[PDB]
């Protein structure tokens, strides 16, 4: 319920945070299940708006 | 000019003031775009709200 309340603009912010976590391998494996659950829920909830965006920088982050 | 937005989700556990409901609405003009708004009357999904302003983002009203 906490994740649904965030507007979309903060979802891009959230997706930048997770990208930053990925470089720090110690944090990634420390909380890997938690990171997965939040990320997948975010993508599913507002998938329609995410795919609509044409930001090239966004496409590289998800990759 | 005033925009029209259809409610797609009635958020819960938002901590809003009594009688005020926080909802998520997608613009009819641009279905992809979404915005979180505050509504005063009884609101359900698939009903359309007339937004006078489309830039303000909803905040919790306590």
């Amino acid at each position: 319920d906490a994740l649904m309340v965030m507007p979309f603009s903060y979802v891009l912010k959230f997706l930048k945070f997770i990208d930053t976590v990925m470089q720090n391998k110690t944090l990634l494996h420390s909380h890997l299940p938690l990171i997965c659950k939040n990320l997948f829920f975010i993508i599913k909830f507002n998938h329609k708006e995410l795919v609509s965006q044409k930001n090239e920088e966004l496409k590289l982050q998800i990759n | 000019p005033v925009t029209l937005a259809k409610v797609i989700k009635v958020l819960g556990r938002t901590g809003s003031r009594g009688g005020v409901t926080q909802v998520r609405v997608e613009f009819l003009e641009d279905t992809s775009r979404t915005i979180v708004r505050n509504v005063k009357g009884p609101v359900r999904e698939n009903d359309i709200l007339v937004l006078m302003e489309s830039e303000r983002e909803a905040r919790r009203l306590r």
Partner: peptide
């Protein structure tokens, strides 16, 4: 006080 989700947005 701030609620879950509201705190996360601040963070």
């Amino acid at each position: 006080s701030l609620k879950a989700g509201e705190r996360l947005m601040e963070a």
